[PDB]
Design a protein around this ligand. Structure first.
Ligand SMILES: Nc1nc2c(ncn2[C@@H]2O[C@H](COP(=O)(O)OP(=O)(O)OP(O)(O)=S)[C@@H](O)[C@H]2O)c(=O)[nH]1
Ligand SMILES: Nc1nc2c(ncn2[C@@H]2O[C@H](COP(=O)(O)OP(=O)(O)OP(O)(O)=S)[C@@H](O)[C@H]2O)c(=O)[nH]1
Ligand SMILES: Nc1nc2c(ncn2[C@@H]2O[C@H](COP(=O)(O)OP(=O)(O)OP(O)(O)=S)[C@@H](O)[C@H]2O)c(=O)[nH]1
Ligand SMILES: Nc1nc2c(ncn2[C@@H]2O[C@H](COP(=O)(O)OP(=O)(O)O)[C@@H](O)[C@H]2O)c(=O)[nH]1
Ligand SMILES: [Mg+2]
Ligand SMILES: [Mg+2]
Ligand SMILES: [Mg+2]
Ligand SMILES: [Mg+2]
Lengths: 395, 329, 393, 395, 395
């Protein structure tokens, strides 16, 4: 059961159960990949826009760019207006609600007022000043309609909207999700049993998250300085762990992953590139599978579980030189920052701990300090000496 | 007055060149302080039960009218111009070799990362053998090596009125300014500040270390640490301070000075029972070569049933246990 | 204990004027706050007799009490008016509606009703209506300041302000004068009634006794722990503890059959009869699962980090129980005790069990300094149910 | 050579494989030099402004000056105007994208609107308020143009653009690279296998990094406080180590480095100056090579490997007085910052441990302290006493 | 004046090599005086502003005051406006480049535009908004001209400009030198072999340091730890140690300094007071030389060489009460600051360690605390007690 079948089913089932899902795990395990594969396949939309939005949190998102904040609004060079503009969540939560009110056959829903609010929400340009207060006139109508509309009609809005928040723990989420700590729970949404319509501070407007809007978060667990310690905020989300999968680096798995998107004659050169790669690895089809899973089980022991090497480092490896460049410029630089000047640990993760010289990645300097301190030197192995030291990590 | 003791050694007040009462009532205020901190001190069948046993001058030492008899609690003690250290009598000789065995005992058993080249530096420095000044050095050298490698600075989110636009302009605070308030910017800044809670702990630990150190080697090491932490706010080291530090990628290189700063600072001095110091010893010994502390697994040295030899006074001791592991396995 | 906890919020709101529901996440603090207020006011939607707001760190005094705000209406210059926050808009709504059913002859009810419809305008105020709203506000407090204290003590409609996640905001900064004002004796018509004038408007402001505040507060976040002792004196603090007895089979039945149709109950009762049969025909399985984990969390952590019963409240099948366990509960415990494997195995009662049907399979490789690590093991079927039977035994 | 072609070749190979590299190492190893040499040779442009930009990160870089943010601008009809201005990255990424759409042959691409957007991006003056609305209009035309473009067209954008970020670790990189932790991945760029287009917070505009744009960071490793320890951000970069090369300081390698800028007889002036220099070093052509390599392996033992002396300290010496000024005013004050009041270690680095007096760099003061502590006085040597004290270091 | 024309020579030779120097040493060694007197000698201008500037770094000093920042200015109708004001380094670097482009006899330099840019750079009142836009336009012309100008003419910019940065270690130098980490190096300047033009974040403007701009920093090395400097920033500067010179404190050397600025009738009246002062010191003409040498060697043993006492305090001493002032208000508070009120260490420096309750500078209090604490108290000695206690330090 691979991503498009089984992990797709995991994201789909837990989004219907919770409304919002955080994909966590080490870097490069495919959390942003399976967030994007899910939402493109669900919306049939390759590009963000109407039915989905991709955003990336950082520490320069605030409450004002996500929900609502005061912004300058210039109709002309002379006239400037200081209005409250909706953030990207409020622009897509109102987009999900208004589009969800297109297809309800209720009598009290004025369809032309709902359809006009959808044009003012999906307008690519900034709105005219004569239609910005129309946009505020229809938003006040929308929260007089919703709010008086029964909960059974309100809980099944058919177009599902998605907000992928990549790097969700990189922003101050409790600062950014102001009023969304309450409203994001599935029963606290519109049509839910404990449906809440909060009041927003800057505009004074009522606000509530519709049931057809979904959030997919990605976060890397390695950085613990931005670890999601808010355990009340953890209750809103289902937490799918996307672990490193070294079984993608088996030769037949590595072939059919990269045979997915190629040309006609461009996929009969990749498999023979992968033939000569694994023939130079000693005909071990599970070479990079065992190489990743031996290093990841060793990083788990000395560093932690969440600092494991993701499979995306070795996923574009086609030759031994590609494997050499992944080793010496991505993996071993990263491994030298895990265990900075802790040389007996970095040689234990490569299980060359007693091996002080020879075909090793870290040769011992022959010189010891004035009080017995010892250093090591990074050795750049090439050819079969690189493979023979890399096959040592397997054995 | 520096007292250098092993467990169950008795030196009278006439033997130590000091005062007849100032050596007495200094550590009297420590073994009653040890009676106050007795419940948090861990024991493994040490047979103390000191709810009122240590109150009758039976804490870490026995305060007799003639002598001072030491107990199984090993470690250092500094109170009222009177330094005291209790060492294991396993490492007792027939003057720096017993102390560094006690350092390397609780380095590989108590889980610290005390480097051997820092202990090798102290040898040959013709200094006085002192448990406190060794741990003052190990804290100050590990802190000075880290601050030289990089000064600890944290990112804090600050909302400031600033006269230069730095960082992110807080728009809802800047829009809602009356036009007589437009000579500043309402900004949100993420600045590298030096006055962190970790640097405030390290500053107040260096301040308390120069208040009691006597080596010129540590004083010169701590004085350059004092000039490094110059712009840091002075704090008082509560136990509340030492738990607000959480170690991530940003500051885990400052964990070795912090676990040494927590061991010294929180009348003061570290004490572990040598009964349980041997309990946590051999469980880290039996698991890589593949518990009663009296003379008669037990300890074996030149002064002192599987006997454990001690080449740790200056890793081939466990290779002689293979002759005992051949019968046990 | 749904009527008693209703009566407990009721007895302590009428005693203090304001309450804070505190406890672990998922205990029903926001639920009983909303359920109390939609039943007292008999209004499903906030806006008229109650408001729902949520505090956060971007919430300030200027959006709660009063602050200056630019207002360019259509063509004219940018007037800088004092915009009323949601507390002042609900305190003046609580007072003016309370004065509308008061029987004092000095109360001019034509000016009171004109002030009420200017307080209940969804649209922003006109610049001519803003000066009218300011005249009536000055008329109100010179009428309130001349009203007797026994008439102001009993104002007719109760108004409610639910502040969800109240500790997530800087409350002492947000409650500027409300530290003094929200005390029950210093409420309007109280025995020590105090009308304080406001900074940005120069306008007097007391809190009417119609208003009641219901705060909900997570106590598992100690960085936003409410440690202002003077602010704690204003509120009654109601602990909403985890209730594992809600997760009994007949209590999970009775909770989930109230918002459901009559012939939709047998799609639920036959789902819960099939759930608890797969748990060994124990009707108290999820009850003693929650109370054994929450006791073990209380020991190696605080009691405020206990699991709420809302995690297992919507469990209908054993695959729903599997998805709550592996995507809500085990990620939560792995964040409670991060790389503390002996603690997380003690909470799951798997302290010595290194291999087998355990949630944490031991890794066979040991580090150079004796480091030991674990991998998350995903159990399925009765191997998952048998591993949950170990935590309850 | 290894630097004449191969260190150039490591940058070129890893920039196409990864999209962005970071050259890390000790100070003075040539990280900024090879970043400038590569990009000037690739773009055939000696100065930035067109087809490449040079920036330096520091602590007052923000997200708002790198990607976008509300920056105040002033006109004559209006005093204070807050405007979302695109930062240096959003300017260089849109410049790379718009210039990449110049040579695409699609009839979907309106060439007049794209050529007008290139003028407003390469405008050296700040944008007029009537041109900033044209600039906001042509950007929103482009991001719906490339959203409907085939990814086979979007990935072969022909003229490569280069953003050199010197001292990249001196800024808060994850705060600076806000949405760029997602977007800078090679298959998450435009025309990639998993092409992502984020939503930006301030302008509300879609954004993606083109494949046309490459980032060359140069970071310093001597300071561990600004060490790039963000494990997920490290995955986006190839980490090329630029080590100190003492073999540049050989006599035959010193002249062929230093004469590439010298034309006709200043080469002859340089030749007999290096002949005069190395004759005074005992006719050892590898003297300065042995001086750097013996000092650096002694620094590697007692301090980290990231504190090694770069070869650029000694790369511009031509006499023994140039070596004397490099020693006593650059190298030896640097070692006294390394081993600060640690005299027994800096004497071990200079191979004079135990030699308290004589022709020594640090003479022992005759006075001892009250606690027995001891100090050493810096002796300034000159002539063959200086060269003889330098021969003690190398052997 | 033989010793001043060689300390001029160290600054002059190393400024030609590195482009920027730092005079470091303890406070009171004449570092600010040497830096100011060298520049008034080189640039024949007594006042700052035209060809040199004086800046002092403090803790609150920033990049925005030094390079550029958005700054609230006012109009000629004194309405507030937000413009990018150039800092003091950028104003003198553009001044050094534009004045260097005066004397270049090229047929491509628009001397009318260059002279108008010089007037706006030498205008000392803040610029009018009608001439601030001219200033931005001429800087836009300048980097257009400089970028297309060869290194043969850009490296020979003839008028040297100077920037004294006093107390440079009192500021966060890497934060203040934002782009100046890269730009200040002699290769990276205009006309250099690796000439780099950077883009500044706030203005969006090109920037580079011209080669005729020199930066002399002064570091009191007892006011900030010198092991907290950046190693990479240390590579840009030549470091000249300015140590205490007690040979200036002899009677003939005190006369040779104080008679270079006053009249002859005041000279021998000053000489009879210096003969009266040195007669009371035992007729020892080397008294203050020996007194400062003995306490500085004693400081160097138990503290740094950076915490030595400078010679400039005793340099204007001509009476015993002048020496009594300097000892009790410039030496003894400075010794108590350096040693953190360690009375036993100071009394060993003052040669009075086993001597209390007498004619000492630190009398012990006769009371002892409950914890056995002993306190010492500064004793003010006058007359023969003060001279007899200063003779105790020498003996
Ligand atoms: N086909 C396929 N490709 C994958 C898979 N996982 C990762 N990849 C490839 O590796 C790249 C990295 O995946 P990504 O989603 O960015 O990992 P991540 O967990 O988000 O990495 P992070 O540093 O941002 S935290 C993706 O662009 C994708 O092309 C997978 O499961 N299947
Ligand atoms: N029927 C019923 N449902 C409850 C009860 N307690 C909680 N719930 C349900 O669980 C959900 C979560 O409750 P909630 O009020 O949001 O918990 P909380 O205490 O506020 O948790 P947090 O906001 O600190 S994270 C609610 O939507 C509610 O439907 C209860 O006592 N009875
Ligand atoms: N020809 C040649 N010159 C070099 C080489 N490495 C360094 N240099 C010279 O030394 C000078 C310093 O190199 P540079 O690139 O600035 O060091 P760096 O890596 O950036 O060091 P840092 O302090 O900023 S962190 C450059 O101007 C360059 O001229 C090299 O490999 N070949
Ligand atoms: N004439 C002369 N004056 C000096 C000398 N050294 C210091 N001074 C004077 O001492 C005073 C203070 O010295 P200063 O330069 O500020 O000390 P520093 O900056 O800490 O090194 C200045 O006013 C100088 O005039 C010197 O060698 N000659
Ligand atoms: Mg990701
Ligand atoms: Mg809640
Ligand atoms: Mg550089
Ligand atoms: Mg000075």
């Amino acid at each position: 059961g691979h991503n498009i079948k089984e992990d797709y089913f995991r994201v789909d089932m837990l989004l219907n159960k919770k409304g919002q899902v955080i994909l966590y795990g080490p870097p490069g395990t495919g959390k942003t990949w399976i967030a994007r594969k899910y939402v493109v396949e669900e919306t049939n939309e390759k590009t963000p826009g109407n039915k989905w939005e991709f955003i990336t949190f950082h520490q320069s998102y605030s409450y004002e760019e996500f929900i609502e904040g005061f912004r300058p609004r210039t109709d002309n060079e002379e006239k400037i207006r200081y209005v409250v503009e909706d953030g990207i969540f409020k622009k897509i939560a109102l987009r999900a609600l208004v589009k969800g009110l297109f297809e309800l056959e209720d009598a009290t829903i004025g369809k032309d007022k709902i359809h006009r609010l959808y044009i003012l929400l999906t307008k690519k340009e900034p709105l005219s000043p004569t239609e910005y207060e129309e946009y505020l006139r229809l938003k006040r109508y929308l929260w007089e309609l919703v709010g008086g509309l029964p909960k059974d009609k309100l809980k099944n809005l058919t177009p599902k909207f998605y907000l992928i928040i990549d790097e969700i723990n990189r922003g101050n989420i409790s600062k950014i999700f102001g009023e969304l700590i309450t409203l994001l729970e599935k029963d606290k949404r519109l049509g839910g049993e404990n449906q809440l319509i909060v009041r927003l501070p800057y505009s004074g407007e009522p606000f509530a998250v519709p049931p057809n809007l979904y959030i997919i978060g990605t976060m890397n667990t390695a950085d613990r300085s931005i670890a999601l310690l808010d355990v009340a905020l953890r209750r809103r989300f289902a937490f799918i762990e996307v672990e490193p999968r070294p079984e993608f680096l088996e030769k037949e798995n590595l072939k059919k992953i990269r045979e997915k998107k190629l040309k006609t004659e461009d996929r009969k050169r990749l498999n023979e590139k992968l033939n000569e790669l694994f023939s130079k690895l000693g005909n071990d089809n599970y070479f990079l599978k065992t190489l990743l899973e031996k290093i990841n089980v060793r990083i788990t022991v000395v560093k932690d579980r969440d600092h494991r090497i993701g499979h995306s480092y070795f996923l574009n490896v086609e030759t031994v030189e590609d494997l050499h460049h992944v080793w010496y410029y991505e993996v071993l630089p990263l491994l030298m920052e895990y265990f900075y000047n802790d040389w007996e640990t970095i040689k234990w993760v490569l299980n060359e701990k007693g091996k002080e010289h020879g075909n090793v990645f870290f040769e011992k300097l022959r010189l010891t300090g004035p009080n017995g301190e010892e250093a090591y030197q990074l050795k750049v192995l090439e050819g079969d000496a690189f493979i023979g030291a890399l096959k040592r990590i397997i054995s | 007055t520096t007292i250098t003791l092993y467990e169950h050694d008795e030196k009278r007040y006439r033997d130590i060149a000091g005062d007849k009462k100032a050596i007495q009532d200094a550590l009297i205020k420590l073994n009653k302080q040890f009676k106050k901190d007795f419940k948090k001190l861990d024991r493994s069948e040490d047979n103390s039960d000191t709810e009122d046993t240590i109150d009758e001058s039976k804490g870490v030492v026995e305060v007799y009218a003639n002598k001072i008899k030491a107990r199984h609690y090993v470690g250092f003690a500094a109170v009222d111009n009177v330094f005291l250290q209790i060492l294991p009598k396993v490492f007792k000789p027939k003057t720096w070799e017993p102390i560094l065995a006690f350092i390397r005992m609780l380095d590989m058993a108590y889980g610290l990362k005390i480097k051997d080249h820092d202990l090798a530096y102290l040898q040959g420095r013709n200094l006085r053998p002192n448990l406190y000044e060794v741990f003052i050095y190990l804290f100050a050298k590990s802190l000075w090596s880290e601050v030289q490698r990089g000064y600890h600075r944290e990112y804090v989110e600050v909302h400031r009125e600033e006269k230069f636009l730095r960082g992110k302009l807080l728009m809802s605070r800047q829009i809602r300014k009356l036009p007589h308030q437009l000579n500043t910017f309402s900004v949100e800044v993420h600045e590298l500040i030096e006055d962190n809670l970790l640097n405030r702990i390290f500053y107040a630990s260096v301040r308390e270390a120069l208040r009691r150190t006597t080596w010129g080697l540590n004083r010169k090491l701590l004085g350059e640490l004092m000039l490094a932490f110059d712009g840091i706010t002075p704090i008082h080291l509560r136990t509340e301070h030492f738990e607000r530090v959480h170690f991530t990628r940003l500051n885990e290189r400052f964990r070795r000075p912090f676990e040494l700063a927590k061991l010294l600072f929180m009348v003061s001095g570290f004490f572990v029972d040598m009964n349980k110091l041997f309990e946590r010893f051999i469980e880290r010994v039996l698991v890589r070569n593949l518990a009663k502390y009296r003379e008669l697994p037990s300890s074996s040295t030149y002064n002192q049933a599987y006997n454990m030899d001690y080449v740790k006074t200056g890793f081939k001791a466990d290779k002689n246990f293979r002759r005992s592991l051949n019968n046990i396995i």
